[PDB]
Design an enzyme around this catalytic site. Structure first.
Site, PDB file in Angstrom:
ATOM      1  N   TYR A 185       0.782  -1.247   0.000  1.00  0.00           N
ATOM      2  CA  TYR A 185       0.000   0.000   0.000  1.00  0.00           C
ATOM      3  C   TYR A 185       0.811   1.294   0.000  1.00  0.00           C
ATOM      4  CZ  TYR A 185      -4.194  -2.833   0.817  1.00  0.00           C
ATOM      5  OH  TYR A 185      -5.157  -3.800   0.714  1.00  0.00           O
ATOM      6  N   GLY A 198     -16.892  -0.226  -4.866  1.00  0.00           N
ATOM      7  CA  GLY A 198     -16.164  -0.474  -6.098  1.00  0.00           C
ATOM      8  C   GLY A 198     -15.087   0.551  -6.369  1.00  0.00           C
ATOM      9  N   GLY A 250     -15.168   3.298  -5.746  1.00  0.00           N
ATOM     10  CA  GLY A 250     -15.842   4.569  -5.930  1.00  0.00           C
ATOM     11  C   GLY A 250     -16.438   4.782  -7.305  1.00  0.00           C
ATOM     12  N   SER A 288     -12.907   5.851   2.650  1.00  0.00           N
ATOM     13  CA  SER A 288     -13.085   7.279   2.444  1.00  0.00           C
ATOM     14  C   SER A 288     -12.122   8.082   3.309  1.00  0.00           C
ATOM     15  CB  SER A 288     -14.516   7.679   2.779  1.00  0.00           C
ATOM     16  OG  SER A 288     -14.669   9.085   2.702  1.00  0.00           O
ATOM     17  N   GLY A 289     -11.460   9.058   2.694  1.00  0.00           N
ATOM     18  CA  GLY A 289     -10.519   9.895   3.418  1.00  0.00           C
ATOM     19  C   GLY A 289     -11.173  11.093   4.081  1.00  0.00           C
TER      20      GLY A 289
HETATM   21  N1  LIG Z   1      -7.256  -7.562   0.012  1.00  0.00           N
HETATM   22  C1  LIG Z   1      -7.071  -6.810  -1.039  1.00  0.00           C
HETATM   23  O1  LIG Z   1      -6.618  -7.256  -2.067  1.00  0.00           O
HETATM   24  C2  LIG Z   1      -7.419  -5.307  -1.040  1.00  0.00           C
HETATM   25  C3  LIG Z   1      -7.189  -4.526  -2.264  1.00  0.00           C
HETATM   26  C4  LIG Z   1      -7.520  -3.147  -2.256  1.00  0.00           C
HETATM   27  C5  LIG Z   1      -8.056  -2.516  -1.098  1.00  0.00           C
HETATM   28  N2  LIG Z   1      -8.259  -3.308   0.081  1.00  0.00           N
HETATM   29  C6  LIG Z   1      -8.797  -2.563   1.284  1.00  0.00           C
HETATM   30  O2  LIG Z   1     -10.249  -2.460   1.152  1.00  0.00           O
HETATM   31  C7  LIG Z   1     -10.688  -1.087   1.308  1.00  0.00           C
HETATM   32  C8  LIG Z   1     -11.753  -0.651   0.308  1.00  0.00           C
HETATM   33  O3  LIG Z   1     -11.169  -0.066  -0.918  1.00  0.00           O
HETATM   34  P1  LIG Z   1     -11.515   1.421  -1.467  1.00  0.00           P
HETATM   35  O4  LIG Z   1     -10.766   0.872  -2.594  1.00  0.00           O
HETATM   36  O5  LIG Z   1     -10.868   1.992  -0.251  1.00  0.00           O
HETATM   37  O6  LIG Z   1     -13.024   1.028  -1.189  1.00  0.00           O
HETATM   38  P2  LIG Z   1     -14.389   1.791  -1.504  1.00  0.00           P
HETATM   39  O7  LIG Z   1     -15.117   1.816  -0.179  1.00  0.00           O
HETATM   40  O8  LIG Z   1     -14.913   1.299  -2.714  1.00  0.00           O
HETATM   41  O9  LIG Z   1     -13.879   3.298  -1.719  1.00  0.00           O
HETATM   42  C9  LIG Z   1     -14.831   4.260  -2.210  1.00  0.00           C
HETATM   43  C10 LIG Z   1     -13.969   5.323  -2.988  1.00  0.00           C
HETATM   44  O10 LIG Z   1     -15.025   6.244  -3.462  1.00  0.00           O
HETATM   45  C11 LIG Z   1     -14.944   7.550  -2.955  1.00  0.00           C
HETATM   46  N3  LIG Z   1     -16.236   7.900  -2.384  1.00  0.00           N
HETATM   47  C12 LIG Z   1     -16.820   7.562  -1.172  1.00  0.00           C
HETATM   48  N4  LIG Z   1     -18.028   8.057  -0.988  1.00  0.00           N
HETATM   49  C13 LIG Z   1     -18.250   8.769  -2.166  1.00  0.00           C
HETATM   50  C14 LIG Z   1     -19.370   9.518  -2.570  1.00  0.00           C
HETATM   51  N5  LIG Z   1     -20.509   9.713  -1.874  1.00  0.00           N
HETATM   52  N6  LIG Z   1     -19.305  10.134  -3.834  1.00  0.00           N
HETATM   53  C15 LIG Z   1     -18.168  10.002  -4.653  1.00  0.00           C
HETATM   54  N7  LIG Z   1     -17.052   9.270  -4.282  1.00  0.00           N
HETATM   55  C16 LIG Z   1     -17.138   8.672  -3.030  1.00  0.00           C
HETATM   56  C17 LIG Z   1     -13.845   7.497  -1.837  1.00  0.00           C
HETATM   57  O11 LIG Z   1     -13.057   8.695  -1.844  1.00  0.00           O
HETATM   58  P3  LIG Z   1     -13.450  10.030  -0.993  1.00  0.00           P
HETATM   59  O12 LIG Z   1     -13.916  10.073   0.458  1.00  0.00           O
HETATM   60  O13 LIG Z   1     -12.128   9.671  -0.343  1.00  0.00           O
HETATM   61  O14 LIG Z   1     -12.843  11.252  -1.639  1.00  0.00           O
HETATM   62  C18 LIG Z   1     -13.076   6.208  -2.094  1.00  0.00           C
HETATM   63  O15 LIG Z   1     -11.910   6.431  -2.885  1.00  0.00           O
HETATM   64  C19 LIG Z   1      -9.382  -0.221   1.424  1.00  0.00           C
HETATM   65  O16 LIG Z   1      -9.447   0.677   2.539  1.00  0.00           O
HETATM   66  C20 LIG Z   1      -8.229  -1.207   1.543  1.00  0.00           C
HETATM   67  O17 LIG Z   1      -7.603  -1.177   2.804  1.00  0.00           O
HETATM   68  C21 LIG Z   1      -7.947  -4.706   0.121  1.00  0.00           C
END
Ligand SMILES: NC(=O)c1ccc[n+]([C@@H]2O[C@H](COP(=O)([O-])OP(=O)(O)OC[C@H]3O[C@@H](n4cnc5c(N)ncnc54)[C@H](OP(=O)(O)O)[C@@H]3O)[C@@H](O)[C@H]2O)c1
Ligand SMILES: NC(=O)c1ccc[n+]([C@@H]2O[C@H](COP(=O)([O-])OP(=O)(O)OC[C@H]3O[C@@H](n4cnc5c(N)ncnc54)[C@H](OP(=O)(O)O)[C@@H]3O)[C@@H](O)[C@H]2O)c1
Ligand SMILES: NC(=O)c1ccc[n+]([C@@H]2O[C@H](COP(=O)([O-])OP(=O)(O)OC[C@H]3O[C@@H](n4cnc5c(N)ncnc54)[C@H](OP(=O)(O)O)[C@@H]3O)[C@@H](O)[C@H]2O)c1
EC number: 1.-.-.-
Lengths: 298, 294, 297
Positions: free
Chosen positions: C55, C213, C215, C263-264
């Site tokens: 990461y 997904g 996002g 989400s950050g």
């Molecule tokens: N085991 C594995 O292979 C593996 C691989 C990858 C990741 N992971 C883990 O799983 C987690 C999930 O991954 P993501 O990839 O973090 O998951 P996610 O929950 O799909 O992330 C949502 C993304 O969409 C944005 N978002 C959230 N709410 C939104 C809204 N209302 N409108 C527009 N955009 C929005 C977020 O950015 P905003 O808030 O930030 O700007 C964020 O980048 C990660 O934290 C990671 O630690 C595991």
């Protein structure tokens, strides 16, 4: 000489590189010549020889048994592996290609193999191929028999799905010695469909066939990226032939396969065994997988 | 009389061939008629009937109960299989077609089937379809509740994959009686994908359903082989060959006859007498798929 | 606060919603800020955190190390999850992207995490992705060691097949705590390929990544029907946002998953955790499945 390796838990001890006699008919060799080849090669350490029911139009076993007859001091020096369970159209009865995992048919085919190879027993009998009409109980009985007859030391399957391997295993009091499957940079599905995971889990060693894609590795024009990569690595490992790089790529899988040599040239069989001494890195491994596939690991 | 067969370890004993009432509503029958039909097929040996929660806009069970209520001596000669787990849009409550595998509902619908079928118990209760939201524990509560009440004798599943079959099984104190799946020369994915391997291994028998084979024309070569093997085995129809093709799989299926024509029921039932040889089986398999075995 | 769940038979106890720091570096956050973020999220109940070897070009763990450094009275209030096993091109030793699951490597990268995260132990260690060259004896061996030395509390796997999971488990004396896999209305192969059937069967709760997904659920043109649905089921449920429904859709699953928030923005990390009170009905669940796939069952 080629290391020794107990293929299963209660299984036998085979030589890491198995010698396969499928194209035997094609090598055109008088029992005189053959016995010479059979010597040179099991002098390298290759003592396990692969055979089968249908091989060479049902001629290969018989042809090989002529060699052991005029050179009977050989049998004790090798392990004979054979299969049964397929019906080729090389026979008038079989108007179509199918399977015959019928209780009586196996015991028929097994005892014929003992007769053709002029041997009193086999070390491994493999159900050649998985049959839609296979009845675990029928096969288990043919096995209990051949066993309490001393005609067959161990039993195994070939090209079985983990579900099919398990099905038949529930019917046996002994651990299936192996599951002869195809593994080569050109054919890598078994690496992830669970076949090799079940085999590592049960500590069963899979004899790998057609590591050289049946020879279409040097001929097929759709493998230049793979032969170019192999050549590169070949220089890095200081190998003699890309074939050795392959016989090593295969040799290093965690399920620990016993590569089956299919060449009829004793010198090509010499090179092979050397691959055992090569030490391939992980990034060299993925580098050859990539070149053979076109994409990267997930 | 058709062969007998205990579908599973500790399981019930059904008739080699089963009668399917999913298309009952298309038979255009009346309790008066349907009672002569039920009487005939079980007189033919077909003593197992296959029903389901939803079949016929949620009323094939009901209709079969009327025929039974006119013949209070039939529901003993037969073994009733029924299902639950699906939710059609036929109901006004169901907007989308979905599944329903929660406890209260698996019981609520089992007792309903008991009512509709004019009887006080089912012989087999199948979880109609594999549900993404199935909670093997909630399901195991309904099955144990019913098994107490004595309103359901044995339990099984339908169209389950070896993993979903095992997920449920693992929570059950008793052997699953069957796993009704689809099997025919025009649909053989189950022969190798491991679903029939699991069943043979467990010594459980699948009630093969849907054994448009005559309708679809891309299936002419298949029809020509069935005809050429019918001749050989001396079969009245190619359908007898089909039933016997299915009937001879090592997992030992119970073909479900879905025809409302009592003439076709009898013909399918006579598929047993046929002694199909191994080569004809691969011959029929190939004409269907178009390619040989590996 | 967010409910507590024990992820496995004799496994640890996390918080239904875990915090994932995969995009940490993308948040352009500073050690003082990050500590405020971490500070806030565990105040909602999101105590568990998800990290990993690779990461952020191998930077994320270390950055979280600084947040834990200038405020080390937090570590005993969170459960750290980290992984190893993958080798990216992000480094120079790697000419290609591959997997490394040797014993010495896993031990080396576990101790490396402790150093970057600035802790004396991990709560769970996952082997990132399934490897063709993975040798269970070698991994099981690196796990015992790390376990006996108190550096790692529990062990799990990630993106494993029920056969690769079953293989590794056969060599371990302790129950794998999870199989961190991807679960979202836009990624369903696991609801039916038998992955989640195993986990429910073994009572092992899976950590779910990329529930939104990555996002693209809100961006991609391709998901208009689905968004229109999450919107209808939203009012129906009186849900705050469509994201919450997506979270509720996931919790609803029978293998009882732990959605990972990525989400950050702490406000978004607040809203999402609220999906824990919405009560979705099957029919709504299957209606969200449909709007995502395009067909029935
Ligand atoms: N085991 C594995 O292979 C593996 C691989 C990858 C990741 N992971 C883990 O799983 C987690 C999930 O991954 P993501 O990839 O973090 O998951 P996610 O929950 O799909 O992330 C949502 C993304 O969409 C944005 N978002 C959230 N709410 C939104 C809204 N209302 N409108 C527009 N955009 C929005 C977020 O950015 P905003 O808030 O930030 O700007 C964020 O980048 C990660 O934290 C990671 O630690 C595991
Ligand atoms: N269980 C099963 O279903 C099954 C099915 C098929 C085969 N098998 C067994 O597994 C073995 C492997 O099959 P193959 O199909 O025999 O495997 P292979 O190892 O791929 O054979 C390589 C083929 O390529 C040729 N070759 C080797 N080096 C070459 C070079 N430098 N340049 C050009 N050609 C070269 C060889 O012929 P040269 O010496 O002859 O000229 C040989 O025929 C067989 O021997 C057989 O016993 C098992
Ligand atoms: N588990 C599940 O999900 C599921 C789903 C659906 C059905 N099922 C069950 O599966 C079983 C069998 O399914 P079907 O789908 O009922 O079975 P089937 O064996 O496919 O029935 C054959 C159908 O073809 C027609 N037919 C027969 N011979 C014919 C011929 N020579 N020419 C033209 N048409 C001919 C029959 O109509 P004739 O009498 O009408 O003319 C009948 O409708 C039943 O018990 C059913 O309830 C299970």
């Amino acid at each position: 000489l080629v290391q020794r390796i107990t293929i299963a838990p209660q299984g036998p001890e085979f030589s890491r590189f198995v010698m396969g006699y499928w194209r035997l008919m094609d090598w055109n060799m008088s029992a005189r010549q053959l016995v010479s080849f059979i010597e040179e090669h099991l002098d390298l350490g290759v003592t396990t020889v692969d055979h089968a029911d249908i091989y060479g139009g049902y001629q290969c076993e018989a042809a090989f048994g002529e060699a052991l007859k005029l050179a009977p001091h050989l049998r004790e020096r090798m392990e004979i592996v054979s299969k049964c369970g397929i019906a080729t159209t090389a026979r008038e009865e079989n108007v179509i290609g199918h399977y015959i995992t019928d209780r009586d048919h196996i015991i028929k085919s097994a005892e014929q193999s003992l007769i053709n190879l002029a041997t009193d027993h086999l070390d491994l009998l493999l159900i050649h191929r998985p049959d839609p009409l296979m009845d675990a109980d029928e096969v288990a009985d043919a096995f209990k028999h051949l066993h309490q007859s001393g005609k067959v030391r161990h039993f195994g399957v070939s090209n079985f799905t983990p579900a099919q391997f398990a099905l038949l295993q529930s019917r046996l009091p002994f651990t299936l010695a192996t599951n002869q499957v195809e593994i080569s940079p050109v054919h890598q599905p078994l690496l992830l469909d669970g076949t090799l995971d079940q085999l590592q889990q049960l500590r069963v060693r899979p004899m790998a066939w057609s590591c050289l894609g049946g020879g279409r590795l040097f001929n097929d024009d759709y493998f230049q990226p793979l032969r170019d990569e192999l050549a590169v690595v070949a220089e890095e490992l200081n190998a003699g032939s890309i074939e050795q790089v392959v016989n090593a790529w295969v040799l290093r899988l965690p399920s620990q396969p016993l590569p089956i040599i299919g060449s009829g040239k004793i010198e090509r069989v010499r090179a092979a065994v050397e691959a055992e001494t090569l030490k391939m890195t992980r990034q060299q491994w993925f580098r050859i997988r990539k070149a053979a596939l076109g994409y990267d690991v997930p």
